[PDB]
């Protein structure tokens, strides 16, 4: 986000990717170097390498020419690694991979390395972005095991690769309104999957299926002739999944599909102002707090988020809208699990409020979020009384404080604000946690939970820091075109809890980024002149 | 008895 | 002559390549062998942005299928699909409906493209 369209390519000149340094320097200047995999989880280091490579690839400007299929092969490091996979994703993410020649597509995909394959599929699909070209969709069709013809001998495809394929597949079918593919996507979400010759249920994939289905049929819900009937059937099916209450867990409709259904019903009626559908999606706090409640609590955040976005006219800018119909209503004011649904209530409400006022900037919204972050910052990552009801609640506060910081950076994007920078700075720095101040595999898992929590805490503040300084401050987010909201909402998907599902999607706001800074330069002298009043007609 | 130790 | 047209086409000399293919057509002893040239010759006109001119060559490449008792070859499949698409923009749905049905025996992506086009023109028929 800091470097969107800064550097330009020379074509002849060879690109370079700086390897991850990951060496910390202390004020005592006693350098300590981290080495993998003894110090950290092995997957993390090259996952960071993949993220850095994506940033390096995205650094190329959109309007740059000369980036053909030969150029990427010219920049190939002769040894595939995470950096080049991220770099490959970046160029495709910027629309450079419009027509990549079939020669070296195989050369990339011949090794079964997941990162390069993931980068190739998502970037290349994002480059074409809805052209419905056959020579490409068939490649993902081969990759996806479920869409492969039934009865065929299973070929080893990684599950994360399947998630990567399906999202790139769905994005290839943007605004296609293709029934033959949409129904297959829907049936894929509910159904169970095969991994290592044993049936398995995945939340990440079902989330990937849900976002895919919502994107294929984006803007297809504004219906007031069989297309209307088929959309109503699809709509009432999704309402069935999201509202079904089961006393006994059915194996093939678990709760893991709830998030995918909610994101799909979200994108179906995005910016449609259908009061009805919002009502069976919006949840009333007064009624639910009386009852025991069911389903995973995290569903509530997505449900209220979806409901607010359906009504793309009444996103309140005041603290009343955020704090509508909320009261603790209990003598025990201590942090207890019963008041978790309220925290997910605000998290969904503030995030939709942030997305609504994306890059337009404001003062009342900024002040309200500043007050909220000032209130919620102190409790953050505070393991005082090690109680599981307490620990689960504070983890939700860790999620809640991540959303507000991201939303606060989102509303004030490309402005380089001071107090916002200060808050994201503190959240960025100082690990806190059980360690510092404020049976071997079992200990490995006990540590791995904490390291994963720190990883989830860092991605949110890093995303906020990048959003504050987007394209060196000369680029801003776009929320006018219908799909721009779709990609923006998709990229800000809060997946900060373990195992950080669909993380590679975080680098996808770049479709909503367009040059939105106007500056004045002199003709004769050729230098910039500033501080001159500009009148605008809107 | 199985469960043979290394 | 046909090879020369490909070389001119690949070097960005579309003005010259038109005359090159036209000479090749006359030299051909049988009309059947002109199916490949007609489709490619029509693409260059589309690259020159005169859609009316490319229609006449599009008629000939489709018509060779009828003269050859329904040859149903690949390079006429793309011809009918493109011809039907333009006819929708012209507002003549009836004249476009028969094109989709005649090309319903192509590749997997070819048939679905015409099938959906058939439904769209059928509703407005």
């Amino acid at each position: 986000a800091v470097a969107y369209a800064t550097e330009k390519p020379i074509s002849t000149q060879k690109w370079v990717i700086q390897p991850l340094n990951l060496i910390s320097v202390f004020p005592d200047d006693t350098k300590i170097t981290v080495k993998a995999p003894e110090d950290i989880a092995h997957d993390i280091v090259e996952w960071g390498q993949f993220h850095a490579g994506v940033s390096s690839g995205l650094r190329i400007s959109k309007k740059a020419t000369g980036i053909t299929g030969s150029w990427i092969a010219f920049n190939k490091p002769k040894e595939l690694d995470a950096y080049h996979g991220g770099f490959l994703l970046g160029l495709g993410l910027n629309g450079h991979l419009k027509n990549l020649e079939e020669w070296h597509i195989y050369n990339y995909l011949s090794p079964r390395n997941t990162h390069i394959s993931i980068g190739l599929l998502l970037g290349m699909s994002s480059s074409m972005k809805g052209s419905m070209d056959s020579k490409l969709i068939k490649v993902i069709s081969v990759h996806l095991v479920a869409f492969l013809p039934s009865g065929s001998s299973d070929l080893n495809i990684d599950l994360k690769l399947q998630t990567a394929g399906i999202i790139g597949m769905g994005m290839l079918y943007l605004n296609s309104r293709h029934k033959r593919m949409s129904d297959s996507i829907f049936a894929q979400l509910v159904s169970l999957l095969n991994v290592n010759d044993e049936m398995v249920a995945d939340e990440e994939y079902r989330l990937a299926a849900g976002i895919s289905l919502g994107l294929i049929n984006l803007g297809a819900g504004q219906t007031k002739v069989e297309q209307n009937v088929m959309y109503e059937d699809l709509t009432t099916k999704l309402l069935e999944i999201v509202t079904s209450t089961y006393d006994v867990e059915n194996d093939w409709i678990p709760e893991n599909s709830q998030i995918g259904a909610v994101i799909a019903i979200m994108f179906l009626f995005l910016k449609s102002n259908n009061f009805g559908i919002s009502n069976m999606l919006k949840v009333d706090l007064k009624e639910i707090l009386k009852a025991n409640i069911n389903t995973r609590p995290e569903l509530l955040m997505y449900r209220e988020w979806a409901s607010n976005m359906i009504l793309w006219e009444f996103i309140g800018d005041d603290l009343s809208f955020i704090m509508k119909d909320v009261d603790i209503g209990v003598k025990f004011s201590e942090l207890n699990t019963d008041l978790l649904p309220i925290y997910y209530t605000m998290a969904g409400r503030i995030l939709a409020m942030g997305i609504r006022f994306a890059s337009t900037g404001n003062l009342k919204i900024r002040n309200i979020l500043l007050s909220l972050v000032d209130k919620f910052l102190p409790l953050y990552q505070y393991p005082g009384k090690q109680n599981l009801d307490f620990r689960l609640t504070i983890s939700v506060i860790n999620v809640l404080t991540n959303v507000i910081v991201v939303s606060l950076s989102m509303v004030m994007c490309a402005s380089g604000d001071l107090e916002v920078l200060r808050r994201v700075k503190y959240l960025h720095e100082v690990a806190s946690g059980p360690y510092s101040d404020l049976s071997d595999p079992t200990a490995y898992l006990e540590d791995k939970k904490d390291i994963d929590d720190h990883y989830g805490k860092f991605i949110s503040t890093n995303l906020a820091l990048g959003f504050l300084f987007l394209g060196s401050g000369q680029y801003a987010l776009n929320t006018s075109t219908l799909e721009s909201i779709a990609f923006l909402s998709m990229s800000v998907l809060p997946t900060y809890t373990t195992p950080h599902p669909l993380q590679e999607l975080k680098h996808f706001w770049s479709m909503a980024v367009e040059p939105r800074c106007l500056v004045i330069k002199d003709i004769s002298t050729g230098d910039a002149v500033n501080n001159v009043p500009i009148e605008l007609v809107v | 008895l199985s469960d043979i130790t290394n | 002559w046909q090879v020369l047209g490909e070389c001119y086409s690949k070097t960005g000399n579309k003005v010259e390549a038109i005359k090159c293919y036209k000479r090749s057509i006359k030299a051909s002893q049988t009309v059947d062998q002109n199916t490949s040239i007609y489709y490619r010759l029509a693409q260059l006109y589309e690259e020159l942005e005169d859609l009316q001119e490319c229609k006449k060559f599009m008629m000939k490449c489709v018509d060779v299928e009828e003269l050859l008792e329904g040859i149903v070859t690949d390079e006429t499949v793309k011809a009918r699909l493109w011809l039907a698409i333009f006819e929708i923009k012209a507002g003549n749905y009836q004249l476009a409906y028969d094109y989709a049905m005649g090309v319903s025996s192509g590749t997997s992506q070819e048939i679905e493209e015409a099938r959906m086009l058939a439904r769209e023109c059928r509703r407005h028929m």
Binding site: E102, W103, H104, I105, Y106, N107, L109, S110, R112, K135, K138, V139, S141, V142, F147, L148, P149, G151, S152, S153, D154, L155, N156, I157 | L1, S2, I4 | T35, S36, E69, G70, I71, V72, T73, D74, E75, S105, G106, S108, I111, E112
Partner: protein, 207 residues
């Protein structure tokens, strides 16, 4: 309809494309799984040149397998493989016939090529040898370990006689228990059975 020898037509496949095409216990299973995925990938991604090529029957998968640098019936015997230039191929198509509309129909439900579908539907060989760690171990403390000794012995009645120390123990597979026969002062060295398990001939350490 037949191309001349001296003036061959050029296929769309390029010099380095053939360089790509020709490129190649649970370990064996994984290696077999990787090879079919790679073969399927290069078959599906390519084949437009191969589809334009060929004269009759055969398949694009057979062409790729023929490139040099329980089995079902092979169709045709051509081993031409990949090639830059083709002589026989002059653009020609067969007229549509009822088999073709049958074929294009079973293709309508297939998101991949029929040839690739046939390759995947083909059954891989389930031919492996399993010689792994024992699936069952019982108890026999204090077993003799002398080079001139041979103690255990099979009998048709799921019955094993063992010389554990200085006593003869009986292990029944059908029951899984241990039964003691007798014991003496001198250790046993060899065990045997006579008839149909009726008698047990045992050799001692003194003959």
């Amino acid at each position: 309809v037949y191309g001349d020898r001296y003036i061959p037509s050029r296929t769309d496949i390029d010099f380095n494309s053939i360089v790509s095409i020709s490129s190649m216990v649970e370990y064996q299973k994984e290696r077999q799984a990787h090879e079919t995925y790679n073969t399927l990938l290069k078959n599906e991604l390519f084949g437009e040149m191969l589809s334009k090529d060929t004269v009759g029957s055969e398949s694009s998968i057979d062409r790729i397998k023929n490139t040099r640098p329980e089995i079902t019936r092979p169709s045709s015997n051509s081993v031409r493989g990949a090639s830059l230039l083709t002589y026989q191929q002059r653009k020609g198509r067969r007229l549509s016939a009822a088999s073709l509309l049958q074929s294009q129909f079973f293709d309508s439900m297939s998101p991949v090529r029929p040839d690739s579908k046939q390759l995947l539907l083909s059954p891989g060989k389930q031919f492996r040898q399993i010689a792994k760690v024992p699936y069952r171990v019982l108890d026999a403390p204090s077993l003799a370990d002398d080079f001139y000794y041979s103690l255990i012995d099979w009998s048709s009645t799921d019955v094993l006689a063992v010389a554990l120390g200085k006593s003869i123990f009986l292990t029944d597979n059908n029951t899984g228990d241990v039964v003691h026969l007798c014991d003496t002062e001198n250790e046993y060295t060899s065990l045997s059975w006579i008839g149909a398990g009726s008698h047990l001939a045992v050799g001692q350490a003194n003959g």
